[PDB]
Design an enzyme around this catalytic site. Structure first.
Site, PDB file in Angstrom:
ATOM      1  N   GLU A 217     -66.362 -53.278 -19.396  1.00 54.43           N
ATOM      2  CA  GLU A 217     -65.993 -53.629 -20.761  1.00 54.43           C
ATOM      3  C   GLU A 217     -66.186 -55.101 -21.097  1.00 54.43           C
ATOM      4  O   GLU A 217     -65.997 -55.478 -22.259  1.00 54.43           O
ATOM      5  CB  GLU A 217     -64.530 -53.243 -21.030  1.00 54.43           C
TER       6      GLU A 217
ATOM      7  N   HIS B 232     -63.201 -34.338 -27.957  1.00 52.53           N
ATOM      8  CA  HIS B 232     -64.096 -35.026 -28.881  1.00 52.53           C
ATOM      9  C   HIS B 232     -64.373 -34.187 -30.124  1.00 52.53           C
ATOM     10  O   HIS B 232     -64.715 -34.726 -31.182  1.00 52.53           O
ATOM     11  CB  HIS B 232     -65.402 -35.388 -28.174  1.00 52.53           C
TER      12      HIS B 232
HETATM   13 ZN    ZN Z   1     -65.414 -48.632 -23.612  1.00 56.15          ZN
END
Ligand code: ZN
Ligand code: NAG
Ligand code: NAG
Ligand code: NAG
Ligand code: CL
EC number: 3.4.17.23
Lengths: 595, 97
Positions: A357, A487
């Protein structure tokens, strides 16, 4: 007063107020995630919708000018690609009916509710109670029942949700004379209007359906090896000539079969080594986890963070006396503000998650030249495309051995590397059979292709023709699948994870442009790569001004994507699988069942 | 200027011009707030939509990065006229031997 001057003299004020509304919403979006108070619950959602309270009537006042004779494609890419079409066109009662079914399709589904139907003395839920029996078991009183236990408890409750949500999309699609409401998901994908450097309108089938034909011969190399890896604790139910059941996921929906690596551990009670927790005896803190994360960016040449980064980000856990959440999310609040939110602790398992990240906010400082109309990914997948490239570049031997974790007394032996390469074998493909059976369901069925007699009887046989994973208990229309997915419940298009795995290696092959190494490709690191210093600087600053079609031409110049750069990096893994298909099941049976 | 012109509640005092149809000439002060607009009308009413008045504001908050954290800029423009020189640099002296 021409419309070209009108476009810029409205869009300058539009982005100037848009960055202010973005920061006023981002303050409420960030101070809640660090300070959970009961006043913050009231103070975050009114101000996160204050950006929407301006936009829901300002976007209609933004495309109030039709932009008929606009000659500069930049402001037309600003306005026309973000046409907020909604409840102002058709109705407000049907749109609030969609908002009402959105309350029961996502909030009631969130965290689940599983009660034991056998005895009331066992009050156990999905994560609190079923996982400790899932982890270690030997009998078949519950394990094969565990997949259809969600179908018998929750799979019968989501039955009115299956039909109206898929027959609302034809009414939703006919608003602005578009052929599909998936073209609202394909709004950044419709790029017609430039000379040659886009994808054509008749090239959509050639763009989507053709790219899956290359990775399918790579699936049968592991479909004959991982299938035969169940000979440890699977008695009298699955023969080695047949296929796998559906309770080998790890969770209830199970969108990947990556978690079979823990099933195939050779010596579980006797670990060979443990190179991950070699930080603990020297006892580094969470600071040096984050100091080296930008030193990984210093070694490639990417600039350091601002001075307002190491005081506002999350470095220590707040705990329970200061109520907070621990969702790992990167943050770009705009106007030069860069910070992150991550569950940081004393452990070492967060190192790979941090290095995955850290490229997100480095990408966030790349498009800082253009305003907020172009301050995103060129597709849905370019926000994590550079984050998934360096996600596997942190566990490299030249980064881990050089700091002093390995033992110098151990001599270099070539026979002990049989278990070092087994971890990454199931990571790259283990979610790709999930991709192509979800690629067919909701693309061209809403224009009058699915009547009321083939709602789910078209859905069921897609699981065994190409994917292969077979059902152990027969079903009917009362066993609705896609309302159980994580999702689908927030209508996330699965196009970004189809282009996620593909678009990494075109730039991962550019790290070693001379002779691919000084030797074998077991080592790869960007420690003092001055040839990769200014190589990726002109790759990443373009953003949206040149679209997702030709965002891969900055250093190589390739028109499309192929899995030919996936051949040289997986050379110890591909020769581990090419000489294996000698005794497993050949072909595929379309009627094999474990009942 | 970090702890000088930064307000958590909002520093809307510093106003600036985002739109002006006429270009500039040096040493020209523009304090007249004539209402700019993109519509062919004499701004019917007093304000509202399609009358984008040229005065805008800043939103300085004390956690911004560089480039957005406010700076204090002053220019000392020098000129040589036909008048006798009245402002000049310092002239240091020595001891009296
Ligand atoms: Zn991510
Ligand atoms: C088009 O707009 C961009 C950004 O607003 C600008 O840089 C460019 O010069 C413009 N092109 C023309 C021909 O005006
Ligand atoms: C980033 O790291 C460099 C060393 O490579 C250092 O000189 C610089 O001061 C750091 N940036 C900040 C904001 O401290
Ligand atoms: C970094 O790499 C360049 C070229 O590969 C080389 O000339 C230079 O000496 C290297 N620097 C260090 C400190 O290794
Ligand atoms: Cl399907």
């Amino acid at each position: 007063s021409t419309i070209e001057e009108q476009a810029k003299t409205f869009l300058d004020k539009f982005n100037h107020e848009a960055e202010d509304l973005f920061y006023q919403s981002s303050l409420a979006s960030w101070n809640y995630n660090t300070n959970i108070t009961e006043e913050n619950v009231q103070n975050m959602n009114n101000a996160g919708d204050k950006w929407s309270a301006f936009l829901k009537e300002q976007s209609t006042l933004a495309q109030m000018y039709p932009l008929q004779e606009i000659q500069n494609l930049t402001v037309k890419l600003q306005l026309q690609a973000l046409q907020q079409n909604g409840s102002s066109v058709l109705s407000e009662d049907k749109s609030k009916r969609l908002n009402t079914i959105l309350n029961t399709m996502s909030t009631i589904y969130s965290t689940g509710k599983v009660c034991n139907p056998d005895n009331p003395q066992e009050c156990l839920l999905l994560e609190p109670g079923l996982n400790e029996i899932m982890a270690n078991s030997l009998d078949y009183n519950e394990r094969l029942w565990a997949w259809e236990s969600w179908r018998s408890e929750v799979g019968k409750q989501l039955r009115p949700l299956y039909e109206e949500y898929v027959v609302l999309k034809n009414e939703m699609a006919r608003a602005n004379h578009y052929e599909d409401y998936g073209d609202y998901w394909r709004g950044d994908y419709e790029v017609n209007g430039v000379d040659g450097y886009d994808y054509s309108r008749g090239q959509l089938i050639e763009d989507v359906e053709h790219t899956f034909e290359e990775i399918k011969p790579l699936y049968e190399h592991l479909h004959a090896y991982v299938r035969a890896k169940l000979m440890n604790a699977y008695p009298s139910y699955i023969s080695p000539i047949g296929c796998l059941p559906a309770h080998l996921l790890g969770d209830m929906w199970g969108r990947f079969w990556t978690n079979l690596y823990s099933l195939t551990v050779p010596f579980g009670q006797k670990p060979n080594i443990d190179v991950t927790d070699a930080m603990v005896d020297q006892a580094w803190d969470a600071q040096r986890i984050f100091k080296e994360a930008e030193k990984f960016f210093v070694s490639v040449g990417l600039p350091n963070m601002t001075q307002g980064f190491w005081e506002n980000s999350m470095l220590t856990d707040p705990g329970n006396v200061q109520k907070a959440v621990c969702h790992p999310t990167a943050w770009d609040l705009g106007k030069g503000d860069f910070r992150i939110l991550m569950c940081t602790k004393v452990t070492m398992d967060d190192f790979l998650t941090a290095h995955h990240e850290m490229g997100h906010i480095q990408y966030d400082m790349a498009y800082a030249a253009q305003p907020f109309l172009l301050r995103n990914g060129a597709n849905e997948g370019f926000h994590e495309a550079v984050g998934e490239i360096m996600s596997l570049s942190a566990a490299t031997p030249k980064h881990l051995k050089s700091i002093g974790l390995l033992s110098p007394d151990f001599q270099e032996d070539n026979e002990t590397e049989i278990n070092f390469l087994l971890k990454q074998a199931l990571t790259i493909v283990g979610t790709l059979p999930f991709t192509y059976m979800l690629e067919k369901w909701r693309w061209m069925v809403f224009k009058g292709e699915i009547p009321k007699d083939q709602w789910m009887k078209k859905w069921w046989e897609m699981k065994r023709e190409i994917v292969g994973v077979v059902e152990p208990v027969p079903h009917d229309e009362t066993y609705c699948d896609p309302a159980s997915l994580f999702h689908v419940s927030n209508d996330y298009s699965f196009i970004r994870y189809y282009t996620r795995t593909l678009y990494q290696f075109q730039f991962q092959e550019a790290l070693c442009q001379a002779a691919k190494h000084e030797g074998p490709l077991h080592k790869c690191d960007i420690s003092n790569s001055t040839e990769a210093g200014q190589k990726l600087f002109n790759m990443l600053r373009l953003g949206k001004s040149e679209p997702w079609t030709l965002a891969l031409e900055n250093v190589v110049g390739a028109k499309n994507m192929n899995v030919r750069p996936l051949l040289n990096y997986f050379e110890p893994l591909f020769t581990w699988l090419k000489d294996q298909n000698k005794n497993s099941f050949v072909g595929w049976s379309t009627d094999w069942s474990p009942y | 200027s970090n702890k000088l012109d930064s307000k958590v509640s909002g520093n809307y005092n510093y106003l600036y011009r985002l739109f002006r149809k006429s270009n500039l000439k040096p040493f020209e002060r523009d304090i007249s707030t004539e209402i700019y607009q993109a519509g062919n009308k004499p701004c019917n009413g007093v304000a509202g939509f399609n009358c984008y008045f040229p005065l805008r504001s800043y939103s300085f908050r004390p956690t911004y990065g560089v480039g957005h954290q406010p700076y204090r800029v002053v220019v000392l423009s020098f000129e040589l006229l036909h008048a006798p020189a009245t402002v000049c640099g310092p002239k240091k002296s020595t001891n009296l031997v």
